[PDB]
Design a protein around this ligand. Structure first.
Ligand code: A1BNV
Ligand code: MG
Ligand code: ZN
Lengths: 98, 147, 49, 91, 1095, 97, 49
DNA sequence: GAGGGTATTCGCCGCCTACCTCTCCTAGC
DNA sequence: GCTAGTGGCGGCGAATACCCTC
RNA sequence: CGGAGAGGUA
């Protein structure tokens, strides 16, 4: 209805969620039980913290590092595949398990 | 029949199918709502949600491996049962069977424990908050003051 | 269902609300407190504000 | 109950505990005396039907209203026969 | 007339007591020391047990090793065993361990023997079992540099317990029994409302007792011969609807292990392994002894077994049926007669004490069981003729168990070190809650009550005030614990109504069979009782008058029931229970002061309390002091040897206080063994001194002492009467970091050279430098990428003082630093705190309050000679709270300070007939003692008040009523009526207002939900809970509540906009959606719920 | 000194059993670290002076200040909302005098 | 809760004996525990109301 | 066999608010 | 240093397990 | 500042 949240709320509706809804919310699938690497302290790919699913961990930076400036705004990297945006996005994006 | 009709009418009046009770996919909460911190020295203290998601993923992956590779009915059924139990523990830990406990023999927190109780989401964060521009100290008596 | 879930028995209330597909009209003190809106009482009433 | 538990049970609309039966039709009563039970029969003035309470334990006393309740005594529609707390649901 | 004559150099404190003490107070740290030296099997314990129970002397470790060994595999062709545990010297001394953050421990070795049954070869080795933490001489452990105290636990003893209940729905008396083992499986019997006896193994369905009886092999003839006299048994044999030993075994197997083949052999094996395994079921020695005593099975045989038996079960069932059939005696075949009755579960004869040694033994036992599993597994997958004891034993689980116990246990607790009394009472503490005890919330009102069996074993006064009320108690003065773990207490035997001097220790169950008189029973210079009838105590809290020839025992003192802290309250019997409890609790919160002074009026339980606590220095051997200094004392013993004692100066306690020791001997004085040679934190000449003597007035004054507030003079600040020293500890470390090599140096970028004035060349402040909030303590830079940032150590908000010491550990000097750190500099800053408004004072009688005001000396009420009063207490708090012992203490304190002389020109006055000689005269500032229950009377107090010495000029300022005529310091007019003045003992509590003031405008926020952090140390915000929201909604204040909930807590953009608006002249903007609602929506979606916001 | 002039401040003591557990006052700077409370509001707060502590909150916006100054001012709440009896009246030492 | 047939004839001005103090302490601690339980029980009722 | 009652029995829910100090955080190759 | 995994108690309602005729 | 435990204040 009101996307994230915007004033002029009218109602708050609840219901059962289908598999289609779950896959629509998802930005990607999680298929490795890896959280974080200890040698580099960076998220593991396809893990519970993968940056290609949940978004960058730094403002306007990619996992590979090809783009690290505000100019490369809104473009998905062609090497790492992480969309270049702000780091607060990790509080909003959800994955899913097939 | 009164109770059966209560539930059946609940599912009939609305435009909602009853097929939502069986799950073909599991959502994963955003990482910033289940952060993992590091203790003095550089050793991580993993959250409880991460452990449950990890167990679910392990069991699902090994079940998929067994299914693809081909195996007798018994092993596939056992893996399916263990996956069922893992997802049940993730959603509501301790409801059925022994709780999935971590180190120290203490039950892990589930997605259903973030909302319930005196320390749950509602009563601890939405009905009450911590605020700025606030202080505290001991009170003494001032007779000279006015009302 | 928000006021009921914030009072007691969160799991049962939530499952019943999900099954019945209940819609919550945010007309109440506790609900407006939860969503951060002016309560419909005192100085938050239309004739006063 | 006689304090905070009494207040809680009043506000929770529970059965009092020491429930005291209350009449439901005006008429005379044929009180019976026995061990571990009393038979209180309501004989209405109209006489359409007779109600009876036989499970009343002898531990509870008989309320005094207007003299103690006795056989062949007329009672009100909402009179409390025994001594105790009547449940809010019957009234 | 004096108090003590045993301690050599004790002050002469004269007592009002009229009773002689047959017995001296025991060592007050004996429980912990004895329990631990039993565990390690020290020679001292060996001798102590030999002079009594020499039949079976074995320590805890030896017992565990005997229990565990031998370890044999299934085939039985090989075995392993352990014996003779041994200890080496401690690796490092106690002070070294405390300084270097080590653990005080000693290596432990055991002898392992490996025997092969088919070859006859024996291979023996000495295997190292890991370092074993060792208790110090003061009853504490040093674990990772922190002193800890292991607390004794009150637990329900193993045994068999019978109880009775009256059912609600029907009128019946239903009986039950429970056989509670030590690490075993429960077993229950009961008779239900259908007059049928049954069984309930663990938490399964009920079964008739006949089923089990036949499963044991009995038949109808056997069961009927013995049982059957009870109608219930003969009725249960009819409706069982089953018969046959194999059938009963199969039924039991079905009930125990559903879904498995019900075979007779499997059922028998499972049952015999459940209740007769000797490894899965155990009663211990206490359990076996208690079961034998209750059922009267074995009276001569020793306690050599620890498992159940058929005779025990049949005796239990017979006992149950006889109890249910209203009988009062029985005689099981081959046993002595015993009465049948129910058991009170809270009786002190039924619940025992697990001391430190027993808890450590349990942990060692579980660790060794894990090691045994490992060794048994490893014994079947290894080649023969190549296995040696060292190749089979894995020590990791044992050391892990010891680490876990001493680090993360509920009974191993951070020691309390406000003052010596706090620690002494912490070591003598009994707690009912722990791993195997009660719950702080679920516990009911009947487990928290005072029981008649507590008399002389647990103090009824000293307990917490919060949710732990009644769950934590303190051991009594004369009590001790016997080998089985039951608390004892001494009694003085009397024969034919003549009190003898022969002390015997009795447990509660033993004591319940006799009647014991009070210590305050008149005597006629010998044991004979003066009066013909005596008031005595009986079984269940009952007192009766009995002829003097029927008395069995007698208390050793009228203070047998109180504890150490409660025995230091003068005029205790004049105070109500609540205020006495408060005073006993609050004596343990006093802070050490710069200078100490002992009370004018005490009780005598202060010299021994100070000596036994251990914070004073005592001369071990006689000699002559050779050299005395502020740092050490040297004693020249008679035999030519010397010993030097080092004084710990300006040390820091676990609670930030100061622990400074001062010598009290001269350079030529001669000392005696056991004499106090130096003072401690709260000690004055070897006596506890927790406060100061102050001249008090008991009037209300202008509303400044309104509602428990206090008024103080300014002399107490000018003369540093109530000043204290507090010490803080700050530390920082330099790690390797993934970025690399963060360093401590004085080169910090973008900092003025003035800000770096106090730092030395290394980069740390200089000793003796004054530090204020925000000041640099250790300059450090970390390479966040030059990019080196500043991550130096600062002084927290509201903290200041003088730097008095620095300790730096550098890896370059081969220091035992943790992994990944190079430097671990520590900084100590101390500050003297004077008394100020908001600080908490208190007397010994439960009177407390914060300092409302501090007045100039020029405007305090003063006596006719011009003496201001130091403190003013309000009149309206005394009579309502039923603590009138403070007024009596005030009167006696004035009498002691002023001095007196009874004018016995023509015989002593009748009120001084029983007053001890040496108490008919005193000099100014005389120290006296009034024991807790045998002290000064009211008539004696009146007499002393009526005869006191004049002041310097020769005038008596306080009349016979204890009241003086004061002047008004502000107007100079005399007050219309006389006021009550005197001296009482005031203590300064560790509740200073400097540690409680906190304010905030903005700071850290939590990450999951963007709300302010909570905590003074975190610079957190004050919580606005649900009830405050209810109050705001009741006021009708909508905008205030909205702003509090949105822009002050978690409106991420609203916060910054509000700050900008305020720092400019603009007005506050409107709020927005808080972040917690979004977090809730995300969690609900994660629960697979389709939540949407419609518009 | 001039910034805090006529800026109301809310004081609260837990537990907040009824409405008068929160009230607004006019701050005035004092020397020390303890808060000085009027003797006539102790009954409303249920506060004695044996060690109690209180929390302070600052209203920011114009509406919040108006509410704190009109609705919640201590001198405007003299009577008990439950029964109407006065709560800010003399007690103890004042009654004796 | 029932009264004992034996009274405490001493007052706190005179000082209770050791057997008249034991029972007094029993009663006092019982009252304190009851007060704690009552304060825990009243808040739940207030929240429900 | 088949309707009419059971008739306990077992599982789940609930159990005041606010603050302060201190210690520990997985085992195995 | 890296990888893997037999001390709470009341209230309420649904559910088995149990007859009771019938 | 994430969690667990222990102790204390009103
Ligand atoms: O009763 C007295 N003192 C007894 C003294 C006593 C203490 C410990 C052991 C044995 C005796 C008492 O404290 N009992 C006791 C202690 C704790 C809990 C219950 C009990 N009781 C009460 C008297 S009870 O009903 O018979 C049976 C249970 C007493 C003496 C003098 C004057 C008046 C008195 F009420
Ligand atoms: Mg108070
Ligand atoms: Zn890239």
């Amino acid at each position: 209805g009101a996307m994230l949240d915007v004033n002029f709320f009218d109602e708050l509706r609840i219901g059962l969620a289908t598999a289609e809804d779950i896959r629509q919310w998802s930005y990607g699938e999680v298929k490795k039980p890896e959280t974080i690497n200890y040698r580099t302290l960076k998220p593991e790919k396809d893990g519970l913290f993968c940056e290609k699913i949940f978004g960058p961990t730094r403002d306007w930076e990619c996992y590979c590092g090809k783009y690290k400036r505000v100019r490369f705004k809104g473009i998905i990297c062609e090497r790492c595949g992480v969309e270049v945006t702000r780091a607060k996005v990790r509080r909003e994006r959800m994955g899913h398990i097939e | 029949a009164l109770k059966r009709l209560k539930v059946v009418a609940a599912f009939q009046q609305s435009g909602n199918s009853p097929m939502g009770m069986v799950l073909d996919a599991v959502p994963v909460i955003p990482p910033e709502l289940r952060p993992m911190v590091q203790l003095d020295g550089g050793r991580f203290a993993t959250s409880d949600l991460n452990d449950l998601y990890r167990r679910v993923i392990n069991r699902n992956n090994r079940l998929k491996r067994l299914i693809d590779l081909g195996a007798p009915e018994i092993i596939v059924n056992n893996e399916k049962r263990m996956l069922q139990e893992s997802v049940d523990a993730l959603f509501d830990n301790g409801r059925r069977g022994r709780p999935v406990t971590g180190p120290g023999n203490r039950p892990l927190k589930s997605l259903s424990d973030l909302l319930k109780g005196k320390q749950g989401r509602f009563r601890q964060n939405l009905l009450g908050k911590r605020v700025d521009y606030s202080g505290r100290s001991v009170i003494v008596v001032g007779p000279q003051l006015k009302l | 269902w928000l006021s009921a879930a914030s009072f007691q028995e969160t799991t049962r209330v939530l499952t019943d609300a999900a099954i019945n597909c209940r819609s919550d009209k945010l007309n109440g003190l506790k609900e407006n407190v939860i969503i951060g809106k002016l309560i419909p009482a005192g100085t938050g009433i239309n004739r006063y504000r | 109950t006689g304090g905070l538990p009494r207040v809680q049970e009043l506000f929770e609309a529970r059965v009092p505990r020491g429930k005291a039966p209350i009449a439901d039709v005006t008429g005379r009563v044929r009180l019976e005396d026995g061990e571990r039970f009393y038979k209180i029969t309501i004989v209405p003035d109209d006489g359409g039907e007779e109600v009876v309470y036989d499970k009343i334990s002898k531990r509870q006393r008989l309320r005094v209203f207007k003299r103690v309740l006795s056989d062949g005594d007329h009672v009100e529609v909402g009179q409390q026969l025994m001594e105790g707390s009547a449940d809010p649901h019957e009234v | 007339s004096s108090s003590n004559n045993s301690v050599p150099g004790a002050p002469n404190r004269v007592s009002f007591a009229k009773l002689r003490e047959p017995l001296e107070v025991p060592g007050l740290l004996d429980v912990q020391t004895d329990s631990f030296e039993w565990l390690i099997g020290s020679p001292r314990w060996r001798e102590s047990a030999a002079e009594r129970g020499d039949v079976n002397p074995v320590g805890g470790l030896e017992e565990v090793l005997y229990e565990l060994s031998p370890i044999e595999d299934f085939s039985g062709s090989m075995s392993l065993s352990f014996s003779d545990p041994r200890f080496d010297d401690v690796k490092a001394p106690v002070d070294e361990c405390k300084d270097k953050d080590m653990t005080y421990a000693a290596p432990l070795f055991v002898t392992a023997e490996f025997i092969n049954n088919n070859t006859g070869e024996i291979k023996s080795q000495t295997v190292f079992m890991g370092d074993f933490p060792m208790m110090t001489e003061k009853g504490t452990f040093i674990i990772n540099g922190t002193e800890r105290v292991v607390v004794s636990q009150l637990v329900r003893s193993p045994g068999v317990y019978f109880d009775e209940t009256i059912d609600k729905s029907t009128d019946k008396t239903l009986h039950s029994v429970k056989v509670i083992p030590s690490r075993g499986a429960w077993l229950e019997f009961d008779v239900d409302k259908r007059d049928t006896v049954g069984v309930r193994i663990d938490r399964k369905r009920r079964q008739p007792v006949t089923v089990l009886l036949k499963a044991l092999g009995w038949t109808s003839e056997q069961i009927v011969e013995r049982f059957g006299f009870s109608e219930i048994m003969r009725s249960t044999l009819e409706k069982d609807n089953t018969v046959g030993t194999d059938e009963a075994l199969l039924d039991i197997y079905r009930k125990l292990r559903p879904g498995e083949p019900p075979t007779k052999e499997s059922a028998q094996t499972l049952l015999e392994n459940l209740f007769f395994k000797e490894k899965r079921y155990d009663l211990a020695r206490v359990g076996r002894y208690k079961v034998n005593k209750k059922l009267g099975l074995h009276v001569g045989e020793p306690i050599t077994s620890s498992t159940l038996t058929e005779e025990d079960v049949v005796a239990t069932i017979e006992y149950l049926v006889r109890l249910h059939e209203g009988q009062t005696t029985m005689t099981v075949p081959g046993g002595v007669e015993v009465p049948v009755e129910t058991d009170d579960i809270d009786h002190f004869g039924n619940r025992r004490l697990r001391t430190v040694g027993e808890l450590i033994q349990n942990q060692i036992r579980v660790g060794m069981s894990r090691m045994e599993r490992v060794v048994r597994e490893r014994m079947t997958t290894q080649d023969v003729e190549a296995i040696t004891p060292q190749t089979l034993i894995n020590i990791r689980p044992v050391v892990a168990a010891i680490k876990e116990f001493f680090g993360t246990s509920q009974l191993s607790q951070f020691m309390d070190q406000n003052n010596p009394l706090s620690g002494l009472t912490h070591k003598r503490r009994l707690s009912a809650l722990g791993p195997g005890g009660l719950s702080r919330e679920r516990a009911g009102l009947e487990v928290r009550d005072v029981h008649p069996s507590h008399y002389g074993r647990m103090c009824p006064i000293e307990t917490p005030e919060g949710p732990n009320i009644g769950l934590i108690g303190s051991l009594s003065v004369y009590a001790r614990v016997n080998p089985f773990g039951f608390i004892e207490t001494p009694y003085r035997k009397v024969v034919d109504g003549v009190v003898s001097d022969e002390i015997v220790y009795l447990t509660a169950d033993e004591e319940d069979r006799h009647v014991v008189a009070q210590a305050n029973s008149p005597i006629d210079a010998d044991g004979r009782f003066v009066e013909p009838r005596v008031l005595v105590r009986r079984k269940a809290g009952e007192v009766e008058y009995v002829p003097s020839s029927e008395v069995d025992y007698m208390d050793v003192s009228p203070r047998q029931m109180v504890s150490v802290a409660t025995a230091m309250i003068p005029f205790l019997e004049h105070d109500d229970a609540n205020r006495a409890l408060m005073g006993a609790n609050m004596q343990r919160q006093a802070v050490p002061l710069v200078r100490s002074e002992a009370p004018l009026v005490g009780t005598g339980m202060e010299l021994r309390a100070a000596i036994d606590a251990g914070d004073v220095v005592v001369a071990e051997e006689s000699g002559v002091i050779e050299e005395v200094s502020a740092d050490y004392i040297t004693v020249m013993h008679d035999n030519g040897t010397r010993r030097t004692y080092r004084m710990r100066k300006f040390a820091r306690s676990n609670h930030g206080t100061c622990a400074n020791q001062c010598p009290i001997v001269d350079a030529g004085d001669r000392v005696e063994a056991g004499q106090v040679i130096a003072d401690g934190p709260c000690t004055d000449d070897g006596e506890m001194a927790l406060g100061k003597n102050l001249l008090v007035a008991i009037m209300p004054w202008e509303g400044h002492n309104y509602e428990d507030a206090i008024i103080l003079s300014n002399r107490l600040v000018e003369e540093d009467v109530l000043t204290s020293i507090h010490i803080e500890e700050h530390e920082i470390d330099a790690r390797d970091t993934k970025l690399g090599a963060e360093e401590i140096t004085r080169d910090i970028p973008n900092i003025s050279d003035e800000v770096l004035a106090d730092l030395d060349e290394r980069g740390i402040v200089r000793i003796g430098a004054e530090v204020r909030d925000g000041d640099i303590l250790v300059g450090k830079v970390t390479p966040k990428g030059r990019e080196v940032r500043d991550t130096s150590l600062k002084v927290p908000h509201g903290e200041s003082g003088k730097v008095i010491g620095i300790r730096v550990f550098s890896r370059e000097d081969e220091d035992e630093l943790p992994a990944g750190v190079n430097e671990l500099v520590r900084v100590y800053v101390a500050q003297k705190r004077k008394i100020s408004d908001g600080d908490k004072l208190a007397g010994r009688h439960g009177n407390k309050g914060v300092i409302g005001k501090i007045l100039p000396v020029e405007d305090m009420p003063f006596l006719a000679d011009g003496t201001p009063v130091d403190i003013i207490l309000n009149t309206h708090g005394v009579p309502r709270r039923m603590n009138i012992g403070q007024i009596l203490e005030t009167h006696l304190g004035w009498c002691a300070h002023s001095g007196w002389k009874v004018d016995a020109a023509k015989g002593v006055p009748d009120w001084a007939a029983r007053l001890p000689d040496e108490l008919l005269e005193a000099q100014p500032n005389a120290i006296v003692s009034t024991p807790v229950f045998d002290g000064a009377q009211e008539a004696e107090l009146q007499g002393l008040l009526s005869c006191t010495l004049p002041n310097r000029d020769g005038d008596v300022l306080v009349d016979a009523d204890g009241k003086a005529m004061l002047f008004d310091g502000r107007s100079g007019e005399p007050f219309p009526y006389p006021v009550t003045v005197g001296y009482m003992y005031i203590m300064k509590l560790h509740h200073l207002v400097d540690d409680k003031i906190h304010a905030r405008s903005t700071g850290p926020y939590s990450m999951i939900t963007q709300q302010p952090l909570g905590g003074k140390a975190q610079f957190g915000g004050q919580r606005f809970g649900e009830m405050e929201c209810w109050a705001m909604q009741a006021y009708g204040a909508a905008y205030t509540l909205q702003e509090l909930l949105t822009i002050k807590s978690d409106d991420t953009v609203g916060r910054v906009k509000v700050y900008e608006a305020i720092v400019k002249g603009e007005n506050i903007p409107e709020p927005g959606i808080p972040e917690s609602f979004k977090v809730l929506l995300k969690e609900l979606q994660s629960l697979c719920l389709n939540v949407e916001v419609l518009s | 000194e001039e910034v805090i002039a006529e800026h109301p401040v809310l004081l609260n003591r837990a537990p907040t059993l009824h409405r008068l557990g929160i009230q607004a006052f006019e701050p005035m700077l004092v020397e020390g670290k303890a808060i000085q409370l009027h003797p006539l509001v102790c009954e409303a707060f249920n506060a004695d002076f044996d060690g109690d502590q209180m929390a302070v909150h600052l209203p920011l916006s114009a509406e919040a200040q108006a509410e704190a100054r009109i609705l919640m001012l201590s001198s405007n709440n003299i009577l008990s909302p439950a029964s109407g009896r006065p709560l800010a009246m003399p007690r103890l030492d004042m009654v004796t005098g | 809760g029932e009264f004992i047939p034996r009274p405490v004839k001493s007052s706190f001005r005179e000082g209770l004996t050791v057997l008249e103090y034991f029972i007094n302490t029993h009663g006092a601690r019982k009252g304190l525990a009851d007060t704690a339980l009552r304060t825990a029980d009243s808040g739940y009722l207030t929240r429900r109301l």
